[PDB]
Design a protein around this nucleic acid. Structure first.
Ligand SMILES: Nc1ncnc2c1ncn2[C@@H]1O[C@H](CSCC[C@H](N)C(=O)O)[C@@H](O)[C@H]1O
Length: 350
DNA sequence: TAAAGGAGGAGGAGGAAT
DNA sequence: ATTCCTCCTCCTCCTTTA
């Protein structure tokens, strides 16, 4: 009957009380290897109960990423890592809208009481939706405040699509370079490959919060001085890889699995534009990743130190008005593939 | 054609009252 | 144990536009 923690500090978050330095982790879940699983907090009833059950009955750590970046992101994490001696990433992130968007405060209305953004999703606001707002705020420009019925209109639209003020009565949606900056990714991390503006948003919505993830993975730097061998499933745009990079942890081996070709080239770009010492191997479909080739890469590079990944949440997310069936869905059922692969690596690390 | 736009809620959290 | 109220969701799918 597990419920959501209030507040979502998990086992603790930087600059916030309620920190815990130890937990009673069951014997069966003891590594090696270390695994790290991420997914949406707000799921249909009985989802996290099933997920945790297959992951050795480990109680999930729910963390809202609002304690790291300016945008909210209520996520649940399951892992077998130590909690003690965690540290955060540098530089410190912009917590409030006032800090993240300095150039917006010249245009920001006094009647907009927001200091935090909502969740960065795959869909963004339209460039004609911002026109419908400007023509509705233009007549009342002479007076300090517009009518309440108009005021209710713009506010509801802003909170829905996460709009920011960039000009006189101009509320435009976020730009990809700003989304990357909020999530922790470097600017133009997803720009290359002739990627369309729409596809950049879809690959950014489905992504980690680097500042949050790296905070958890920070307990791996002193214990692995020589580096690590990572096996990332559903790697996307390399949320876990960017986290380790800024954590100053050497990455000997990275075996990534990604069905999307454009997402694969992003990681390859980040690998070459960083001049990484280690080696990158890229797989496509996770349903074709046989355990023969798994144990093949195992005996050559010497096992896997970390198995990080975040299963698809298309059937779990509340935004889905068509096919929100839970782990019974088409995309979200691939979580068991994570379990299968994770079961194979454990078999040899024993 | 490839890209942007628009139409379209259920479902719980988290309240602050009894 | 109650209400009643406000808010937020790693979104799918059809249509329009350049
Ligand atoms: N059958 C499959 N095999 C491998 N990857 C898949 C897959 N189905 C979907 N995916 C990938 O899973 C991703 C969503 S989950 C990825 C989360 C996030 N991008 C991260 O950094 O971890 C999508 O980018 C998609 O390309």
């Amino acid at each position: 009957p597990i419920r959501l923690p209030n507040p979502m500090i998990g086992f603790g978050v930087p600059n916030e009380p309620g920190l815990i330095t130890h937990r009673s982790l069951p014997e069966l879940a003891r590594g090696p290897p270390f695994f790290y699983y991420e997914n949406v907090a707000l799921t249909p009833k009985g989802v996290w109960e099933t997920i945790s059950r297959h992951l050795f009955e480990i109680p999930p750590e729910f963390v809202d990423s609002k304690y790291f970046c300016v945008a909210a992101r209520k996520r649940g994490y399951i892992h077998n890592l130590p909690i003690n001696n965690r540290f955060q990433i540098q530089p410190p992130p912009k917590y409030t809208i006032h800090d993240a968007f300095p150039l917006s405060k010249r245009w920001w209305p006094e009647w907009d009481k927001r200091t935090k953004l909502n969740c960065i999703l795959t869909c963004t606001g339209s460039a004609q939706l911002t026109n419908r707002i400007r023509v509705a705020l233009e007549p009342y420009n002479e007076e300090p405040e517009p009518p309440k019925h108009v005021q209710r209109y713009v506010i509801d639209q802003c909170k829905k699509w996460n709009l920011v003020w960039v000009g006189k009565n101009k509320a435009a949606p976020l730009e990809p370079d700003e989304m990357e900056s909020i999530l922790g990714f470097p600017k133009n991390h997803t720009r290359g490959g002739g990627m369309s503006r729409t596809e950049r948003f879809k690959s950014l919505g489905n992504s980690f919060q680097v500042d949050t993830v790296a905070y958890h993975l920070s307990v791996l730097k002193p214990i692995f001085p020589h580096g690590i061998n990572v096996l990332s499933l559903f790697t996307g745009i390399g949320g876990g890889e960017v986290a380790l990079h800024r954590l100053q942890i050497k990455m000997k081996l990275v075996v990534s699995v990604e069905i999307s070709k454009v997402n694969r080239n992003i990681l390859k770009d980040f690998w070459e534009q960083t001049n990484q010492t280690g080696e990158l191997i890229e797989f496509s479909d996770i349903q074709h990743l046989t355990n023969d080739t798994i144990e093949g890469l195992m005996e050559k590079y010497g096992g896997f130190d970390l198995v990080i990944g975040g299963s698809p949440c298309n059937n779990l997310a509340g935004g889905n008005r068509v096919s929100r069936v839970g782990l019974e869905g088409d995309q979200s059922s691939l979580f068991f593939e994570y379990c299968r692969i994770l079961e194979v690596v454990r078999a040899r690390m024993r």
